[PDB]
Amino acid sequence: SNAMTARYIAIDWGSTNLRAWLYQGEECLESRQSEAGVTRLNGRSPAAVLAEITQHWRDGATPVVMAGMVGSNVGWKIAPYLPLPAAFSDIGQQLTAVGDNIWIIPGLCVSRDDNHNVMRGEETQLLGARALAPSSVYVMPGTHCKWVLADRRQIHDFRTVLTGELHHLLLQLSLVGAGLPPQETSAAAFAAGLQRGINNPAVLPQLFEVRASHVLGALPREQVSEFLSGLLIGAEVATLSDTFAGQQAISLVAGSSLTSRYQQAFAAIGREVSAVAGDTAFQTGIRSIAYAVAN
Amino acid sequence: MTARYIAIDWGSTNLRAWLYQGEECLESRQSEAGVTRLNGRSPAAVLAEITQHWRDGATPVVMAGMVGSNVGWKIAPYLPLPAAFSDIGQQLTAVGDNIWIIPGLCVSRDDNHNVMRGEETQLLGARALAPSSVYVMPGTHCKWVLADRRQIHDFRTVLTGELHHLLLQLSLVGAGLPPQETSAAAFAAGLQRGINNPAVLPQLFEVRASHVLGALPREQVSEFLSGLLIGAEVATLSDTFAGQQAISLVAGSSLTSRYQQAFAAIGREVSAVAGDTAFQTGIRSIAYAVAN
Incomplete structure (x- = not known):
């Protein structure tokens, strides 16, 4: 039927x-x-x-x-989480x-000596991205960014980077951003942060330098958020890009604003991406599960 | 006299x-x-x-x-580096x-913007009490300082203490944890993970996943995270601030112990001086120069 x-x-x-x-x-x-x-x-x-x-x-x-x-x-x-590796088709059967x-x-997990990881919710967008923009590598940015390795049948591994969360923590709860004025859009500050993060995946010393740069007048006070965003995203992509290698275009799953930030980050390290909207990926993924239940 | x-x-x-x-x-x-x-x-x-x-x-x-x-x-106003140790009491x-x-110190060039205010006084003390080419001054904002016998050349700052606090108590990592306990073993494990991952960003979430999946006891998260952040710090900067003499570590007793363990894990010698003793010897050297 x-x-x-x-x-x-x-x-x-x-x-x-x-x-x-x-x-x-x-x-x-x-x-x-x-x-x-x-x-x-x-x-x-x-x-x-x-x-x-x-x-x-x-x-x-x-x-x-x-x-x-x-x-x-x-x-x-x-x-309960499904441990990886798991077939895409296991999600809807479990x-x-x-x-x-x-x-x-259910979400997905990885548990081995060098990787403990969980996701809950992003597996559904993953299922959608698998239909709409298949790749060996999916990057799914947000508060927590998921990087996923998969082939056409199985999800093999993933890592999580706290990029959005760390931006929030540093700008709004830490001394890095204390006392700043209202923040403004700046394509130039973002681009400059990106270059700094790409060259410093071992990024820890760079975090304080965001504050020192605005204190010493090298970074305008209104452009700190944009610089910090570029720094964190840049460091993220430089950390993981060679570990999530692929001939195929990374499939980038996110809303439109954050998609274009990650596209720019990937272009600065010479990697091609295919983009699929997060909301479209979510609905296509959910639909694949609903069709299994109604089958 | x-x-x-x-x-x-x-x-x-x-x-x-x-x-x-x-x-x-x-x-x-x-x-x-x-x-x-x-x-x-x-x-x-x-x-x-x-x-x-x-x-x-x-x-x-x-x-x-x-x-x-x-x-x-x-x-x-901050004294820009390079500056002689003796410049501080004359300005x-x-x-x-x-x-x-x-006054504090600063560095302002394309690849390093940095400031400190307070730690220079401990540094002057540490220069008398445990001289070295490299001083590490841990805390909320850890200062790593490169100097020779006469001049302070350069420094970097790592937000180890602040980031630890924020990630444990202000973020989703440590959300839902019971009161935290001392654990030599969890600290030592975090240290190994951090030393091997100076590009530490993906490891931060895995601390939370580790406890969700039962690999790290819920009460030993603070200790693991401390080892992770300190280990990553030390593996990030140790080869950049190289030197034959023992690093001069300037800190109170808890952090001294953590950093000694971190430096021993990467084969690097350390001479410790208490931060309070360093401060007083530093201020004293300035007062003596004012009294003359």
């Missing part, structure tokens, strides 16, 4: 935001959002919150497929059942 | 003062009136109160730290009669 005529509900349930979509095939019939992330439920059960946000959408036959922190230990029910045709997508 | 002087360490949140006659500390005092917590008092009034009954015509006050920053009493900033502020 034809899965494209099947209704399904896609959920992305984070620690602080909840997004829900009702789909029929590639048609998004309705979408809803709530501030009721899993650590912000304000005393309600996850089951009650899901029923509220899917009100008038449910009808017995319609599966609910959920990604993200809803399957963590602070979520509804633990969906869903955690929470009752009544409601399913949680 | 020996100099009478008053030594001040005046930080953002704390003030300490000592009356000395040569090496004899006659009296010490402390106050919560850091230069950002004056509570509407003038710095001059805070200093008058803390030096009450100590003052005479011939007794200079020598002050280090944030008192000489742009949020302090009066700016003691004090006067704020009043025989009251002097010690």
Whole structure:
């Protein structure tokens, strides 16, 4: 029978935001959002919150497929990590059942002497990127950036870099950014940071120099955020690029602003990327799981 | 035969003062009136109160730290490097009669922008008490200094203490952890990981993954992270600040121990001097140059 005529509900349930979509095939019939992330439920059960946000959408036959922190230990029910290497096709065959045709997508893990790593949520965008922009290497930037090695059937390995988080920590909570004025866009400061980070993957001494540079007048006070961003992204790409080698274009999975920052970083070290929007990758990935459940 | 002087360490949140006659500390005092917590008092009034009954015509006050920053009493501009160790006591900033502020140091060239204010005074002490070509001064902001017998040539700063605190207590790494415990083993393991990964950025998240997956006890995260950051620091800078003489490590007793272990893991000798002893010997050498 034809899965494209099947209704399904896609959920992305984070620690602080909840997004829900009702789909029929590639048609998004309705979408809803709530501030009721899993650590912000304000005393309600996850089951009650899901029923509220899917009100008038449910009808017995319609599966609910959920990604993200809803399957963590602070979520509804633990969906245990799948250890790597794992087939792309394992994800959709290993869903955690929470009752009544409601399913949680598990994250992925790696556990060996030289690599301990987890992801939860990004596997769903990965599945989408595998359909939309296949590669041996996927880079998925954000607060935490995932770099993933895969072939056409299996996900082999990944690493995580705290780029967005560290930018936040350094600019807004640390002495590096203390006392700065409102921050402005600067293509030149970003480009200069990028060059500095690319040449200093062993980046630790460079962090304080961002502050000293603005104190001594070599970096305008309004351009610190942009310089810091370039430094961290540059150091990230120089650290991992030769370890995530590939003839094929890295497939870069992110929103449009951050895509173009990483494209610029990759161009400064001579690497080609194919870009796929994070939201498109998410929905294509979720859909692949919903079609398995409705098969 | 020996100099009478008053030594001040005046930080953002704390003030300490000592009356000395040569090496004899006659009296010490402390106050919560850091230069950002004056509570509407003038710095001059805070200093008058803390030096009450100590003052005479011939007794200079020598002050280090944030008192000489742009949020302090009066700016003691940074001395650009290279500078002779002896240049520091000849370029004090006067704020009043025989009251002097010690200036920090800076470097400003294409591949190095750096500042310090406070640590130069410890450095002057360490130059007398454990001379070396390389001084490492750990803390919130670790200073690594290159110098010869006469001149301070260069320095770098690593935010080891600040980054440790932020990543443990202000970020998703240490979110959800129980109270943290001492662990020689977790520190030693972090050290090995950091020494082998100076390009440390991917390793930071793996500390959190390590505890999620049961490879690192939830209560030993602080210790592992400490080893990781210190190990990465030392592997980043050791070959750049090379030298045959023992690195002169200037720190309190906890950090001294961590850094000794970090340097021993990469085969590098260390001569330790306590940071408080270094500070006092440093301030003393300046007071003696003022008294003349």
